[PDB]
C-alpha cells in the first residue's frame with residue numbers, strides 16, 4: 001500500500017528549489033502533471049510530480065481548492081521556478097504519455113523540451129501487441145505492482161471528484177507514484193529497447209520526436225461549421241423518412257428496416273434465396289448482392305447507412321466543438337494499433353466514408369478560417385509503392401516510375417492487352433488483386449469481392465504471380481521469417497510480433513500469416529507518414545509560416561494555409577514529404593486545396 005510516508009508533498013518554495021537543484025543534476029527524471037479535466041485545451045493544471053530516483057519522488061500541489069485546503073505554492077510561482085528546467089532541452093524527462101503533459105504546459109506559455117522518454121512508447125515499440133500500454137497495465141506487467149487508480153482517489157460516476165477537490169496527501173500518493181513508477185518502468189524497459197537497433201531507431205527518431213508534434217496538432221484542432229452539419233442532419237431526417245416510404249411502397253404495409261426480423265419475411269417471401277445479410281459482413285453481404293436487381297435490399301441498405309452516418313457524425317460532431325477554441329480537437333493515439341499507424345477518436349476521422357457522397361458532405365463541414373484554405377497532402381497509394389519496393393519487382397516499379405495507373409498497368413499484364421485499352425472491369429479486377437495482396441487475401445476472397453467464381457479468381461491470381469514473380473517471392477519470404485523469428489519488420493525497424501504464427505489453430509495461424517505479409521507494408525507507410533509529420537512540423541517551428549497542421553488521416557496530412565501563401569507552401573510541403581523521409585521507396589505526394597476538406601481532398 002502506498003501511504004503518506006512514501007512521497008513528499010512540496011508546499012514551500014525553499015523545498016521546491018532544493019528539488020529543482022537535484023533535478024538539474026540528475027541524469028534523467030520522471031515528470032508528470034495533474035489537471036482538473038481530461039480535456040487538454042481547457043484543463044487547468046492542479047499539480048506536478050517528479051521522481052529523481054526509484055522511490056524518491058514528490059508532488060507539488062498548486063491549485064487544490066477544496067474547503068480549508070492548506071496553503072500551496074501558487075501555480076504561477078511554481079511554474080516560473082520550474083520553467084527553466086522544463087524548457088531546457090538538455091534536461092531529459094521520462095513520462096507516461098508526455099503528449100498530454102507537454103500540452104498542459106503549453107497552456108501557460110511553457111515549451112516542454114528534453115522530451116526524451118515516454119514509457120508508453122517504450123512499451124509500444126518493444127512489443128505493440130504485448131498488451132495495453134497504459135501505465136497501470138505496464139506497472140503490473142513489468143513491475144508486478146498495482147498502481148493507485150484515479151477512481152480510487154476521485155471516486156466513480158457523475159459524482160466523481162476533479163483533482164483539485166482531492167486532499168493534498170491523497171493526490172500526492174497518486175501523483176508521486178505516477179512519477180516513481182514511470183521512472184522505474186523506464187529503467188527496466190530502456191535497457192531492453194537496446195537489444196535491437198531497429199526498434200531503437202523507430203523509438204528514437206520516429207516515435208519520441210512525434211510526441212510534441214501530435215500535441216500541437218491536437219491542440220490546434222480543426223474548424224467545423226455546425227450550421228452545415230445541422231442542415232445535413234435535418235436533410236437526412238427528411239431523406240430517411242422518404243426512404244421509409246419508398247421501402248413501404250415497394251412492398252406492402254409498414255415495417256422496420258431490420259433483417260433477420262422483418263426484411264427476410266418480405267425480401268424472400270417475395271422471392272430470393274433464404275440466407276440473410278450480416279452487418280462476415282465484407283465477405284458475403286446478402287443485401288448488396290440482391291441490390292443489383294431487387295430494389296428493397298437497395299433502399300434498406302441505403303437507409304441504414306444514412307441513419308448510422310447521421311448519429312455518428314452529423315449529430316455528434318457539432319457537440320464536439322470546444323467552447324474555448326470554437327474548434328474540434330480529435331484524440332490521436334500513438335500506441336494502439338498493432339502495425340504502428342496512428343488511430344483517431346472523437347472524432348474517428350478515418351471512419352468518415354471516403355468513396356460516398358454523404359461522406360463528402362461531412363468533410364465539407366471541415367472548413368478553413370477566413371483568409372485561409374485547407375490544403376491536403378496525400379501519399380498516392382503509398383502501400384502499393386511499398387509492396388513494389390519490398391518485392392523488388394521491376395514491373396510494378398517501372399509502372400510507378402513512368403507515372404502509369406498501376407491498376408491499369410497491372411491489368412494490362414494480367415489480362416495481356418495494351419494499357420490504353422484496359423477496361424473499367426479489368427482495372428477493377430486488378431485493383432482488387434493488388435489491394436488484396438496487401439491484406440494477404442485468398443483467391444476465394446478475391447472472388448467474393450469481385451463476384452466471380454472461385455478458381456476464376458485463382459486464375460487471375462496465378463496470372464498475376466507469373467507476371468509479377470517478385471510479389472509472390474516477397475510473400476513467401478515474409479511468411480518464412482515470420483515463423484522463423486516470430487515477428488516481421490518495417491523498413492525502419494519497427495516490429496510486429498506474431499504469437500499465433502504457429503497457433504496449430506487454423507483460423508488463428510491463418511490470421512497470423514496475413515498479418516505477416518501486411519505489417520511490413522502498413523507499418524512502413526506509418527513510419528513514412530510519421531517522419532513527414534516530424535519534418536513538416538520542424539519546418540513549421542523553424543520558419544513559422546502561416547500554416548497549421550490540423551489533421552492526419554489515412555495517408556494524408558491536412559493543413560490550414562493562408563490564401564496568399566498557398567503556392568509557396570504547397571511546394572514546400574510537397575518537397576518535405578516526398579524528399580525528406582525515406583529515399584528508397586518511390587514516393588509521390590498529391591497536393592490539393594480548397595475552402596474545405598472535401599474540396600482539398
Ligand SMILES: [Mg+2]
Nearest residue numbers: 396410434468
Ligand atoms: Mg500489383
Ligand SMILES: [Zn+2]
Nearest residue numbers: 032033175178
Ligand atoms: Zn499523474
Ligand SMILES: [Zn+2]
Nearest residue numbers: 382383525555
Ligand atoms: Zn493506404
Ligand SMILES: [Zn+2]
Nearest residue numbers: 553554555556
Ligand atoms: Zn484520404
Ligand SMILES: [Zn+2]
Nearest residue numbers: 574578588589
Ligand atoms: Zn514531386
